[PDB]
């Protein structure tokens, strides 16, 4: 199927409590495979998935150098953005970067991403052309100009179209028995009266990978979007994810309701009803 790799950097200042923490995590789809944390006792890139462990010392050292240098640069960047926004030295701020590459079912590059935020708001993003920038405000425009002057987009593009895809494909092969395995949701519908005239139907999806899933309730074949309580897909801690969708229905009308489940790992989409 389609696959992506993403790295997520968080740099978080904390005036009076040392230098800003830098943490990087890397993912292939919904599987984290690496971390680096500048607050670790001995900061080093560490494996977080079994299939990355086979990478040799040169890989780990290369990662660690990248992250150690980025740690220092992000501290400069935090100082710089504080200035761009005329902010006091007192406050704690956060720069986030998410970037990486998306492959289609054929393994070819679909597109690259390289997005940054400051204090949780869009700051600057590499456009899909991987050649131009979108700056959110006049502060981010300073970064844009700086990055234009330093030919930064070319660096990002070279990575996104080159090493990003290369290494993603490598990981996909090395971890193929998990990364390229979709585990379908195990499903059931529960029923809980809420009163004498209403009951809750809850449609469960458990044990699925990847996280992407569609779980909906229909009444008489019509989507009950507004009436459905849909919890965020949540990790089980064993790589799989869980989700449920609930609707409160008039007692006696339960069979008018169907839960529909779409997921990569299902040989076919599910239609489920309460089974008393």
């Amino acid at each position: 199927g389609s696959h992506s790799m993403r790295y997520f950097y968080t740099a978080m200042s904390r005036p009076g409590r040392g230098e800003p923490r830098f943490i990087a995590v890397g993912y292939v789809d919904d599987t984290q495979f690496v971390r680096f944390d500048s607050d670790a006792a001995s900061p080093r890139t560490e494996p977080r998935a079994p299939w990355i462990e086979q990478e040799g010392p040169e890989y780990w050292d290369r990662n660690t150098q990248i992250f150690k240098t980025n740690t220092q640069t992000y501290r400069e960047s935090l100082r710089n953005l504080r200035g761009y926004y005329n902010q006091s030295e007192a406050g704690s701020h956060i720069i986030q970067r998410m970037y990486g590459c998306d492959l289609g079912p054929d393994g070819r590059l679909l597109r690259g991403h390289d997005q940054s935020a400051y204090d949780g708001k869009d700051y600057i993003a590499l456009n899909e052309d991987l050649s131009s920038w979108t700056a959110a405000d006049t502060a981010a425009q300073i970064t844009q100009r700086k990055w234009e002057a330093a030919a930064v987009a070319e660096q990002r593009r070279a990575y996104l179209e080159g090493l990003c895809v290369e290494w993603l494909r490598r990981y996909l092969e090395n971890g193929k028995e998990t990364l390229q395995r979709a585990d379908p949701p195990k499903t059931h519908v529960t029923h809980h009266p809420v009163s004498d005239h209403e009951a809750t139907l809850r449609c469960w999806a458990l044990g699925f990978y990847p996280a992407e899933i569609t779980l909906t309730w229909q009444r008489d074949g019509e989507d009950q979007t507004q009436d459905t309580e849909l919890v965020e897909t949540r990790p089980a801690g064993d790589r799989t994810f869980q989700k449920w969708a609930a609707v409160v229905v008039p007692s006696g009308e339960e069979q008018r309701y169907t839960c529909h489940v779409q997921h990569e790992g299902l040989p076919k989409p599910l239609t489920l009803r309460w089974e008393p």
Binding site: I66, L163, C164
Partner: peptide, 13 residues
Amino acid sequence: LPEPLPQGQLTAY
């Protein structure tokens, strides 16, 4: 693999 360091100075924001 994350984005490698550029040949010159990594550009800050």
